[PDB]
Every structure is written in C-alpha cells, then in structure tokens.
Amino acid sequence: STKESKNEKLKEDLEREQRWLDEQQQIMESLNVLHSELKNKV
Amino acid sequence: GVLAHLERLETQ
Amino acid sequence: PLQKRLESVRKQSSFILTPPRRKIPQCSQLQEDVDPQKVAFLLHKQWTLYSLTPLYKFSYSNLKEYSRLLNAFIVAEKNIKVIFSTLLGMKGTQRDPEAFLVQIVSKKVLWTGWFCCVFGDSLLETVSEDFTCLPLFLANGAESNTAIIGTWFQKTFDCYFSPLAINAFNLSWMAAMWTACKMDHYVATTEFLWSVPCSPQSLDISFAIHPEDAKALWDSVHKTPGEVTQEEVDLFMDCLYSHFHRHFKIHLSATRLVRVSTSVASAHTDGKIKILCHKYLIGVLAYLTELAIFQIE
Amino acid sequence: DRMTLLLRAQTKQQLLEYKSMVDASEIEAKIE
Amino acid sequence: IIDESD
Amino acid sequence: ASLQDDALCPYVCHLLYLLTKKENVKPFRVRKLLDLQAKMGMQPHLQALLSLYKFFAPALISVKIYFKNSENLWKTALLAVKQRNRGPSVIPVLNSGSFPLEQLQSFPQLLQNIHCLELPSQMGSVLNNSLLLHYINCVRDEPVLLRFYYWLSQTLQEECIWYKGKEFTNFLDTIIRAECFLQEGFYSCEAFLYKSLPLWDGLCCRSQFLQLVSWIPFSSFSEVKPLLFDHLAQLFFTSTIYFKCSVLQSLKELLQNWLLWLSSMNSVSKLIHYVGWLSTTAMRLESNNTFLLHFILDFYEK
Amino acid sequence: SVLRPLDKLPGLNTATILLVGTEDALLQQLADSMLKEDCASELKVHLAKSLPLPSSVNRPRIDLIVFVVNLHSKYSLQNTEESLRHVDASFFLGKVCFLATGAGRESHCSIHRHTVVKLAHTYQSPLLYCDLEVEGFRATMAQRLVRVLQICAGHVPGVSALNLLSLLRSSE
Amino acid sequence: DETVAEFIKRTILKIPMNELTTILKAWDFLSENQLQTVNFRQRKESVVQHLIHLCEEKRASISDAALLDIIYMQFHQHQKVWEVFQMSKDLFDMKQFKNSFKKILQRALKNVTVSFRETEENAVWIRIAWGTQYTKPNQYKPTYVVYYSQTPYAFTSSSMLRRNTPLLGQALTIASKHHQIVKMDLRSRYLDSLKAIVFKQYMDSRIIHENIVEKERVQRITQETFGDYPQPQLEFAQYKLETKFKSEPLRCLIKFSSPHLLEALKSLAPAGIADAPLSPLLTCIPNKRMNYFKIRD
C-alpha cells in the first residue's frame, strides 16, 4: 500500500514539476525578449 | 501521499 | 550576505555557555537631553511589554504623516487625536536609534506607546541600513487601542509585537539586580509574590522585607563588589527559602514567582513594569532590552 | 514453547551481562 | 511568641 | 473631472483608486485633489485616493480599502464562480513607471511587467500567489530576505504557541508546497525546527515536521549533529518502526536534495556512515523486520 | 541505603521501573499511561519521593531508574541532587534517565534548561523532554519508556544498557 | 423629599432587577396592588420611574429607605469587609436597648441617621449614616453594625468608621450594659464564615507505591488537623513577624490571598509543598479565632 501511495504521489509531483517547468519556460522567453528590447532601445 | 499513508498507519 | 552570518551566529547560540556576570548599575542622574517632565509622566506608571522585529523604512522626520495615518485608521475602525513626539537621551549607545512616543489625546491622554532600544547592538550588528531597530515597546492604556495600533503597525512596517514573558530565573536575577542598587530614599519595601500551581485558584503568597533588612542581607550575601553573579542570586534565594521554611516549614521553592517589587521598580511575569526612580531607569531598559533580543533570536 | 525459548534467551543475555559486570569489577578515543 | 497585645 | 460632482465623488474616487497608475499622478491633479479635500474635508474615499497618490508620488505631496455603497449589485452565482476563478489572518491581506501589484491578475501581465515590479509592503501573500513567487525566485534581494525571515519566524512561533490545529496543519502544508518551489530551503523553518525538536514529542505534527528536514541547507556534518541529529537519533531509537521508515524517507530525500544542490564530500560521507549506523542498529532492534529493510534498500538504491 | 542493580534476581520475564519526583499526581498519571497497555513481559511500577529508597526485604530488581524534573521549581532539582547521592555509579551506566516536564512553556520554566542539560551531560545519562500534562505527549512518552525498558531489561537480544547509552549519547 | 427619592433610586439601581420583586416582598412598604401595577419585564428606566411614582404616591421617608438599604445589604452581605468587637463584664429588652442606643447616638454630636431591623437568629442589623454638627447626615457613606442579643460579640462594617471609632464602641457597650469593649485583630469579607468561626458553629496492583507510609501519615495528619467538614470560607490573612535570623532581628510581613483559604492550605501537604505537620501559625486560624498575627523572637 505504501508502494502504490508513493507511486501516485510521484506521479502527482512529476505532473507539478512539468507544470512549473512549462511556466518558467515562457517566463524565460519573456525575460530574454524584454532584456533584448531594452538592450536594443539603449 | 506515502507519508500521509504512514501517518494513517500509526493512527492504527 | 547578512543572512548567512546571522544563521551562523544563531547556530552558535546554544544553552551551553555560562551565564555572564552583570555589572551593578550606579546612581546616575537623568541626562541633559532627558526632559524631567516627560520621564515623570513615563515614570510612576504601568507599562506592558512587547518585543518587536526591526522597523522597515522608518523615518523620524515624517512624524505628522504617521500621526494622520493612525488617525485615519482609527476613524476607519470607528473627538480624539494622535500625537507623535521625539524623546532624547534614553538610548544606550549612539548605535541605538532615537526613541519616540505616541499619545492618544481626547479633545486627557488615554493611550501611550513607547518604542526604544537600550544597549541593544546584537540586533543592530545583524541588520542592514534600511531598518530601524527599536525592538522594545511599552504600552499604557486600553487594550483595544493597543490592538488597533498593533494592527496598523503590522500593515505598515511588516512587523509584529510579541507579548514578552519573564520566567522565574530572569525575575529573580533582576530582583537581585535592583536590590544591589543603592537607593538614598527607601520609599518602598521590597515585596515578592508567588502563585501555587493549581487549576482552582489557590493561595498566593506575598513576602515583604524591610529595606534595611533586605540591604543588610544582600551585603551579607554580596561577594563581588559592583557585580552580580549567579551564585549570589542562588544564595539570595536559598537564604529567603531557608528563612521561610524556618518560619513555617513550607517549601516556598516549589512555587512559581510571579511578581517582584522593590523600592526602585517592580516587575510581573505577564509583562507589567512599574518604574519609580529615574536614577537607574536607563539601566533597567538595557536589561529588559536583552530579553527582546532573546525573543527575536 | 515460545515463552520457554524467550525466557531462555533473556536468561542468556542476563548471564552474559552479569559475567561482564563481574569481569569489569577487577580517554575518549579508546572508548570510541 | 505570638504577641497578642496589638 | 467628475470629482467636482459631489453626487459622483465617492464612486469616482473608488474607480480612480483601482484605475490609478504612477503615470496618472500629475501635479495638477494632486493640487486639485488637495483643494477638493480642503473643501469637503478628509472624506474616506478622498483619503484613500490621496494615500494612493502619496504612494505613487511622495515628492509632490509634501510640496484593499473599504468604500461606502460598494455592495456588488450584480453578484450572481456564476459571476461569483468566475470571480473566484479570477484568483489563481494567517496570510496578510495584500496592500499594493512601476506596475501596480493589484493589476497583476494574469500571467501575460507578469510576463510584460516583470522588470518594473514593486515589492509588496507584506510578502505573506507571495506564498499563496505564485505570480509574485516567480519574481521572488530571482530577485535575490537582501532586505526582503530578512523581512520574510522575521515574518515567517514570528508567525511560526505564534502559531505553535497558539496550537497548545487544522489551520496550523494547512498553513504548514502551504509552506511545504512553497518550499517545493524555489528548489531551496528556508531558514525560518530551520530555526523553528532547531528550537522545537528537543521539545518535540514526535507526534504533534509529525507529517509536517518530517517534510521540512528534507529541505535543509547543505552544511558540514559537524555542527548539525550536536544540535539536530542527536534528538533525531533520540526519537529514532525509541519511536515506532513506521516512524523509523518515515525518518529514513526524510533523510533519503535530504540526501537527494543535497546532491541536486551540489551538482564537502567528507560531509556526505559522514552522513552516509551515520545513517548506515542507524540502519544496522534499528535492523537489529526490530527483530530483523523486513519492513524497515525495504526502506534501507530503497535509500541505498537512491 | 544505596541501591544496587545487581542485588537480587528478577522474575520470569518481569521488568520493573522506578519514578522519583515531587508531584505525586503527575507520577500516578504517568504510571497510568505506563500500564494503559501491557506487553508480553509483566511490568512493575514503583513511585518514590526521595532517596534512599525505603527499606524492604521483598524488593525485586529495579532494572530502570527514571528521575522526573520540573523546570517550574528548584525544589524538584534539590530533591534530585540530594537523591542522587544514594545510588551507586553502576546505575549511571544506562540504567538512569532524566525526564523534564513543562520545558515547552519557556515562560513557566523557573530554572533554565541549560542547568539540567549540564547536569545530564555531567553524568553522561540520557535526557528526554516531554509534557506530562498533554495526554498525547504523555502517551508518546509512555511507549517511549516502555520500549526503553524493554531495551535495557535485556529482553531483546543484541544490546545492553551501555549500548543504548552509546546510542543516546550527546555530542556535548 | 427629593433626597430620599434619589436615595431609593440609587438603592434600586444597586439591586439587580432579577430579584427586585423579592426586595418588595422583603420591603413591604408599598401595597401589593402597587407592585402589580408594575411589570418587571419592561425596561430598567421604566421600572425605576414607576417605583418612584409608587413611593411618591405614598409618603417617602428616611426610615423606609434605610430599611430597604438594610435588606439589600442582607441579600448581598458580600460587598463589605467586617471586623469583630468583643464586649465583656443579664437582662435584655429590645425596646429599651433601642431607646438607649438612639439616645446615645443623638447625644453624640447632635444627630445621626439610625435605623434598626430585627433579623432571624437575633441578628439586629443597624444602619448608621453619620453627620456633623452643621450638616445633614450623609446617605452615601453609611456603616452597618450587627448585634446579637445577650452575646459577647458584635460585627461592624468599617468603610468610614475610622473617622470616629471610639464613639460607636462606647455607644454599643453602654447600650449592651457591658463595661469593657475591645477590638480583636480579625478582618474578613465572608460574613457567614465569620459567624461560624466566632461561635464555633462550623486498583492496578501492578503499581507498587513506595514511601506509602509517608503518604498515609501526611493525609492522616492533614485530615486530623482540618477535618472532613467544609472549612469556613476565609479570604485574607496577614502575619507581621519580627524574629531573630539565627542562620538585630529580621522583620517579615506576609499576606495570604485566596478566594478559598483553608482549602489550598489543606491541599499543600497532600501536594507535598509543605511538611506533614503544618506550623501552628496556620493550623489555629479557626482554633485561636485570630486572622492577623505578630511574631517576635
């Protein structure tokens, strides 16, 4: 029963990890494009 | 999850 | 940055080092910048203790802005006014920031708040430049006003007041500390208060000693001149307990000390402080200032 | 049965401890 | 002695 | 310009309180608002708008607010579920060309305005608002570190003293969820656990405590053992076998986190030797129960 | 009368515990928590106020010594150090333990916990912190004491009192 | 008169409205029909105004108002502190006693507001309102004296009696046909307990307890010293001691405060706080009929 419980726990944690990874991705492109725009403006 | 499972095991 | 060395210093903070001896305060007149009327209003009054995290972005110039903001908050909560004043001369060192008073006047002062820090440098040694370190708060007035002011300060400066507590060890130490102090005019006999631990309210022993007898016993159990040591405090308590047991065959040692009053000042476990004599006032603050740090750390 | 064998084991450990105590009747790195 | 004279 | 009308004045003030940015706080408007305050008096809505103007432009002044009649007349049930979906006291209520924090309600807004963000007066709402957590992850600002440290430490102290429970458990669960992010441990929790571990019975909030030891900052295995691992062994040698498996899981998670952070070696070697000594001692202790052996072997695979 | 661990012989799968302190009601409640559940081995509980223990020719082996200390009163301390002079050093080899009550309430702790920590470290004896007032904490300490009794009594093969002392030893 | 009207109004305001009806049943100055004309479910202002109307319809005086105040005191008998006077050195009559007391108090200076009210167990209750040679006696600072016929004891509430104490004592002793009158140092608030004290009218065999002889001895000694009967409800004690140190005599001063004394003291020995035999200074409180003590070497 511990083995199942940890199996679904790891599945949920992995899904949350992909969620965070996806969000920080567009965070990174937004930050990079903002930095490039500021660099080009000056 | 599994930690909640162990805790419900000590509940017994 | 500051966080790393702060982690290290509270890692080094363990209950392994011996309690250091404390220097007995000497008769010190009020400082020149200290206004006698302001302290006279402060002294001979009851104060409730509060420990505070360092202020964030606190300026002593825009006091009127703070007063009007508190007034606006109060009227939002609901013939009263809020007054901010700056009090000089009660900082332990130049490092300790300037102290100030806040008053509620019904257009007759009803609620007073004091923010201060005396000889408190460990917090000042672990703080950045933006913050202001006055971790000592004294409240005198209605509890509702105190709660409202605390709510405003929590919303504004991102801090809390914590009700500072004093145990029996600290209270006995401070009792010995002021009974070591020399008072020219013994105007209040020393008095201790106890409370037996029992779910129904039970007997509360109050034990009073004549100031001359107390001073004689102290000097008998006084070994290091100008300094107080843990052995002195322990022998003081042991002599009192032995006297009580010789009188009544009752082990007072199995009882919780709850209030200690002497000629100069009086303290209570819940956080009540009464001050009578100015000559040691400043030193008093310094001692209790350490407790705020000991609650912050 | 099981109670007999567990009593036997406990008596064995008690006897070993008593033997160690009677033998011992006659720094920190060494102890470590 | 419990002084009863007060 | 609708502030001249005294029938629209409170509602116009309530609208401007939500609409005002830093660019809108012009000197002429500050002067006219001060004159209107002098004419009408320190009205609540006027004072709220004036406090916002002071926040945006403090130099022009010296030279979460309730408004009356603000009842939502259009509050249907579906509008309520949409308003609650629009939000993606233990936690302080948040109080505000920098981007206003209240206007931050969408992910693209944060993407556009990450550079011009402003630190909140209180950052407790940062915990349950992932939007500000994104900027916190990289801000690396010294003052906010101390501000959050004192905040969370005193919050933990007051919650613990008030407990002696479900709200405390939920708050600690939220703290753990935030700790899963940032890929690094906090120090307020570390200090609280150091203070409370010797006093810890082992069953008050065991689920909550054992997940914080997983996120412990890397340190030499010579200062934590005298203060931390001694009471850990004290509980381990005397508590339930399931609690032993529990602390084994906690320490293996700690080992995983430490290896992840590092990617020195003497410290982890000593930690492994210590956990192995605990392992063999407990394996003897429980009449050689394979239940703990499974955790031993899983830890060793990790 | 100095107590000795090696005076008489124990019963068939019998274990005994001793609790010395001042608060009789707390000791009674702690013993009630002790005997809420009984393991395979029979358990005997003894309660006393001070040492030396009253003379009794019918005394069985006392395989464990536990001193309860309240940080709320120095009287309990003075009791503990006065009673400590009526026991041989052999008990100090893992047959003695200290349990402090009320340590959580730092406001109510009369004596500072550093004092009792130093006292325990001086004699190299295990030190435990618990709150007898709380039912849950008392129960947890109950299985803790039952199982440390099982370890020290020699019921489980493999370890002895000095082994658990080397286990429960503090760094400093 | 308006003075008696406002006096009655103040007394009614002191009376809780939940028992006002009983007051009337104990007052009986107003007819029962007048009582029926007033409902007690309505507002406090309304009921007090109706009572004022009722008493103004009849003739309001000082004697009836004083009787109402006396009966209010009877029903409460918990708001004042009582002291006990002893007379020493056999025919009694109510009427002549009242006449003599009234004559003496009138001869005191010129006048005094004196009212009598006989109660069960020969408890004559006397309300006295003092007045100087040039002013009507004040009804806001009254005193109460309780006299028991053919008895050597009397009770007095001392709220303002310290102004003229010997006058009341000499009047009481001359009215009681007794020569010597003294004040014992015994002061308390529970008047009924004073009444009682002055007249003396009051399993898991696996556990093997050790030192059980000590427990059985201490409980037996405590039971023999105190007793199964509920101890009198005494609330305040104070000892003034001056004895040689033996460890220039030390002067000590202790005060015992407890909502229920003689019970926490009863539980000290079972709790182990004090020795099994308590000191005589605490075991003779009901025996010696003494509450304040003085000790010398």
A27: chain F residues, CB-CB within 8 Å: 111, 114, 134
Q: H293: which strand partners?
A: H239
For residues C2-30, b (16+ Cβ closer than 10 Å) or e, as one string?
eeeebbeebeeeeeeeeeeebebbeeeeb
Contact with chain C for residue H248, Cβ under 8 A: yes
Q: F259: which strand partners?
A: none
Written as six digits, the tokens of A26 are 């567009």
Written as six digits, the tokens of G38 are 């009984």
What is the C-alpha to C-alpha distance for residues F246 and F229, in angstroms, rounded to an integer?
Answer: 15
**Conformation bin of residue H204: beta by default, left when phi > 0, alpha when psi is -120 to 50:** left
Q: For strand G14-20 and strand C46-52, is the pairing parallel, antiparallel, or unpaired?
A: unpaired
CB atoms A6 and B1 under 8 Å = yes
What is the C-alpha to C-alpha distance for residues C82 and C63, in angstroms, rounded to an integer?
Answer: 11
Cis omega (within 30 of 0) on the bond before G52? yes
What is the C-alpha to C-alpha distance for residues C286 and C210, in angstroms, rounded to an integer?
Answer: 27
Q: What is the DSSP letter of F214?
A: T
Q: What's the length of chain B?
A: 12
Q: How far is F145 from chain C (nearest CA, A)?
A: 7
Q: How far is F250 from chain B (nearest CA, A)?
A: 10
Q: C188: which strand partners?
A: none
Q: H128: which strand partners?
A: H114, H143
Is residue F208 within 8 Å of F173, Cβ to Cβ? yes
Residues 63-102 of G with CB under 8 A from D: 90
Helix axes C63-77, C143-157, angle to 10 degrees: 120
Instruction: Identify which of G6, G12, G157 has the shortest CB distance to residue D9.
Output: G157
- Candidates H145, H8, H148, H3; CA nearest to H66 is H8
What is the C-alpha to C-alpha distance for residues F32 and F20, in angstroms, rounded to an integer?
Answer: 15
Chains that touch A (3 or more CB pairs under 8 A): B, F
Q: How far is D10 from chain G (nearest CA, A)?
A: 5
CB atoms C239 and H252 under 8 Å = no
Residues 6+ apart with CB under 8 A from H220: none
Quick check: do F and B touch, 3+ CB pairs under 8 A?
yes
Residues 194-233 of C with CB under 8 A from H: 196, 198, 200-210, 213, 216-217
C-alpha dist (Å) from residue A1 to F201, F245, H145: 27, 14, 82
Nearest residue of chain G to residue H205 (CA atoms): G44
Number of neighbouring beta carbons within 10 Å of residue F183: 12
Q: How many beta-carbon pairs below 8 A join chains F and G?
A: 47
For residues F217-248, b (16+ Cβ closer than 10 Å) or e, as one string?
eeeebeebbeebbbbbbbbbbbbbbbbbbbbb
Burial class (CB in 10 A: 0-12, 13-18, 19+), A25: exposed
Breaks (C-N over 2.5 A) in chain F follow: 63, 88, 96, 164, 263
Residues 15-34 of A with CB under 8 A from F: 16, 20, 23-24, 26-27, 30-31, 34
Residues 6+ apart with CB under 8 A from F269: none
- Candidates F154, G141, H75, H240; CA nearest to C162 is F154
C-alpha dist (Å) from residue F230 to F226, F235, G17, G133: 6, 9, 25, 25
Residues 6+ apart with CB under 8 A from F79: none
Residues 56-75 of C with CB under 8 A from H: none
- Which residue ranges form the domains of chain G, and what is each CATH number? 14-168 (3.40.50.300)
Q: Where are the alpha helices (DSSP H) in chain F?
A: 9-19, 27-40, 44-56, 58-62, 77-85, 107-113, 125-128, 130-139, 142-163, 166-180, 188-196, 206-212, 224, 230-236, 241-262, 265-285, 290-301
- Candidates C54, C40, C95; CA nearest to C296 is C54
Is residue C92 within 8 Å of C118, Cβ to Cβ? yes
- Candidates F139, F140, F120; CA nearest to F128 is F120
Q: Quick one: resolution in A?
A: 8.9
What is the C-alpha to C-alpha distance for residues H65 and C129, in angstroms, rounded to an integer?
Answer: 73
- Candidates H73, H58, H53, H57; CA nearest to H9 is H53
Identify the three-state secondary structure at position H256: strand
Breaks (C-N over 2.5 A) in chain H follow: 89, 202, 247
What is the C-alpha to C-alpha distance for residues F125 and F101, in angstroms, rounded to an integer?
Answer: 11
The structure tokens 């007072």 sit at: C252
Nearest residue of chain C to residue F144 (CA atoms): C56
Residue D31, amino acid:
I
What is the C-alpha to C-alpha distance for residues G69 and G118, in angstroms, rounded to an integer?
Answer: 14
Q: Where are the alpha helices (DSSP H) in H78-141?
A: 94-108
Q: What is the DSSP letter of G87?
A: B
Give the CA angle between residues H144, H146, H149 to the nearest 5°.
Answer: 155
Q: H253: which strand partners?
A: C208, H240
Written as six digits, the tokens of F103 are 């206007």
Residues 92-151 of G with CB under 8 A from D: none
What is the C-alpha to C-alpha distance for residues C139 and F224, in angstroms, rounded to an integer?
Answer: 40
> What is the residue-wise DSSP string for G117-157?
HHHHHHHT--EEEE-SSSHHHHHHHHHHHHHHHHHHTT-ST
Is residue G126 within 8 Å of G168, Cβ to Cβ? yes
What is the C-alpha to C-alpha distance for residues F99 and F21, in angstroms, rounded to an integer?
Answer: 8
Number of neighbouring beta carbons within 10 Å of residue C220: 12
Written as six digits, the tokens of G24 are 């009789």
Is residue F292 within 8 Å of F241, Cβ to Cβ? yes
Q: How far is H13 from chain C (nearest CA, A)?
A: 27
C-alpha dist (Å) from residue C216 to C180, C187, H85: 11, 17, 40
Nearest residue of chain F to residue G137 (CA atoms): F201
Nearest residue of chain G to residue C168 (CA atoms): G110
Quick check: do C and H touch, 3+ CB pairs under 8 A?
yes
Contact with chain G for residue F84, Cβ under 8 A: no
What is the C-alpha to C-alpha distance for residues F25 and C181, in angstroms, rounded to an integer?
Answer: 60
Nearest residue of chain H to residue E5 (CA atoms): H294
Written as six digits, the tokens of F99 are 């981007």
Q: How far is E5 from chain H (nearest CA, A)?
A: 9
Q: What is the DSSP letter of G51?
A: S
φ, ψ of residue F27 in degrees (nearest 5): -60, -40
Q: How far is G79 from chain H (nearest CA, A)?
A: 12
The structure tokens 């308006």 sit at: H2
Dihedral sign computed on CA atoms, order H13, H16, H21, H22: negative
Identify the three-state secondary structure at position G66: strand
Q: For strand C136-140 and strand C109-116, is the pairing parallel, antiparallel, or unpaired?
A: antiparallel
Contact with chain C for residue F55, Cβ under 8 A: no
Instruction: Identify which of H211, H270, H271 has the shortest CB distance to residue G48.
Output: H211
Quick check: do E and A touch, 3+ CB pairs under 8 A?
no
What is the C-alpha to C-alpha distance for residues G71 and G66, in angstroms, rounded to an integer?
Answer: 16
Written as six digits, the tokens of F220 are 């030499």
Contact with chain C for residue F27, Cβ under 8 A: no
CB atoms F234 and G128 under 8 Å = yes
User: Residue D4 half-sphere exposure, CB side, CA atoms within 13 Å?
Assistant: 1
φ, ψ of residue G53 in degrees (nearest 5): -65, 145
Identify the three-state secondary structure at position F147: helix
Helix axes C230-248, C211-220, angle to 10 degrees: 120
What is the C-alpha to C-alpha distance for residues F159 and F172, in angstroms, rounded to an integer?
Answer: 10
Residues 6+ apart with CB under 8 A from H263: C202, H231
- Candidates C54, C83, C52, C79; CA nearest to C66 is C83
Query: Per DSSP, which regions of G1-149 are E strands?
Result: 14-20, 42-48, 65-70, 96-101, 127-130
Q: What is the DSSP letter of E2?
A: B
Written as six digits, the tokens of A8 are 């679904």
Q: What is the DSSP letter of F240?
A: -
The distance of Cα H190 from the centroid of its chain, to the nearest Å, equals: 6
Written as six digits, the tokens of C65 are 């802005």
Number of neighbouring beta carbons within 10 Å of residue H189: 17
Chains that touch H (3 or more CB pairs under 8 A): C, E, G
Helix axes C230-248, C168-180, angle to 10 degrees: 100
What is the C-alpha to C-alpha distance for residues C110 and H78, in angstroms, rounded to an integer?
Answer: 33
Q: What is the 3-state secondary structure (H, E, C) of chain C?
A: CHHHHHHHHHHHCCCCCCCCCEECCCCCCCCCCCCHHHHHHHCCCEEEEEEECCEECCCCCCHHHHHHHHHHHHHHHCCEEEEEEEECCCCCCCCCCCEEEEEEEECCEEEEEEEECCCCCHHHHCCCCCEECCCEEEEECCHHHHHHHHHHHHHHHCCCEECCCCCHHHHHHHHHHHHHCCCCCCCCCEEEEEECCCCCCCCEEEEEECHHHHHHHHHHCCCCCCEECHHHHHHHHHHHHHHHHHHHCECHHHCEEEEEECCCEEEECCCEEEECCHHHHHHHHHHHHHHHHHHHC
Q: How far is G123 from chain D (nearest CA, A)?
A: 15
CA dihedral H271, H274, H276, H280 (to 10 degrees): -130
Contact with chain B for residue A11, Cβ under 8 A: no
Residue H85, amino acid:
F
Give the CA angle between residues G108, G110, G114 to the nearest 5°.
Answer: 110
